[PDB]
């Protein structure tokens, strides 16, 4: 790896610089290098990792949706035949997206998840595993589509089980996991009732636990609670 010769601390420092400069591809490459040092990640470091790859894949997904939409239009009756280019370029972006997802899933499997013993780390990584299988599922059309969806579901479910046992209902990781698993249900698993039920129950259980929190924890938890409410408003 091209980051093999750089100090772990230097990679973390540069990931932060890359974040300030909105250089998310660089940020991701630095964090990959850091993970590949083989030491566990701290809370801050886990966040750096997730921020970097979320921004990179988020851009790829946005582009994929633009291209897939143009491609769909081209296959409507009355559309002039324009050749293979739209499919080719959608495929190019798709392949790049899949590569990023496989990279992240690779880091999680080798060996972030297996070394993660504390709830905050294990739930966070299992959420990411669910998230990156979900992105693979968004573009899947083949023999393995069902297995990709189940891989997402399984990772989210394991994360859910741990989060309910080991974290308070207001914990931002628990909230974020629930938000994304709810989206999984709505957009990937064709289960809008499960999505709505999950978002509602998570919101209400968190509401009931806000009284235990500091002002700063309250701000963190309520921010994610609002995203649950936003989705519920979108869906009802």
């Amino acid at each position: 790896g091209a980051m093999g010769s750089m100090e772990r601390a230097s990679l973390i420092q540069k990931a932060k610089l890359a974040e300030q400069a909105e250089r998310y591809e660089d940020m991701a490459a630095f964090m990959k290098g850091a993970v590949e040092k083989g030491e566990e990640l701290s809370c801050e470091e886990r966040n750096l990792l997730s921020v970097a790859y979320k921004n990179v894949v988020g851009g790829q997904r946005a582009a994929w949706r633009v291209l897939s939409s143009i491609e769909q239009k081209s296959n409507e009756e009355g559309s002039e035949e324009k050749g293979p280019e739209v499919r080719e370029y959608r495929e190019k972006v798709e392949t790049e997206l899949q590569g990023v997802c496989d990279t992240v899933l690779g880091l999680l499997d080798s060996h972030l998840i297996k070394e993660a013993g504390d709830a905050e780390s294990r739930v966070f990584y299992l959420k990411m595993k669910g998230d990156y299988y979900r992105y693979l599922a968004e573009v899947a059309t083949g023999d393995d589509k069902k297995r990709i969806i189940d891989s997402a579901r399984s990772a989210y479910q394991e994360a859910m089980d741990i989060s309910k046992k080991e974290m308070p209902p207001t914990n931002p990781i628990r909230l974020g996991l629930a938000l994304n698993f709810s989206v999984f249900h709505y957009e990937i698993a064709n289960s809008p009732e499960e999505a709505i039920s999950l978002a509602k129950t998570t919101f209400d259980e968190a509401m009931a636990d806000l009284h235990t929190l500091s002002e700063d924890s309250y701000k963190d938890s309520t921010l994610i609670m609002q995203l649950l409410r936003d989705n519920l408003t979108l869906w009802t």
């Binding site: 998230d131 938000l179 989206v183 709505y186 989705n231």
Partner: peptide
Amino acid sequence: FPATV
């Protein structure tokens, strides 16, 4: 699209 984090 819906919100995720």
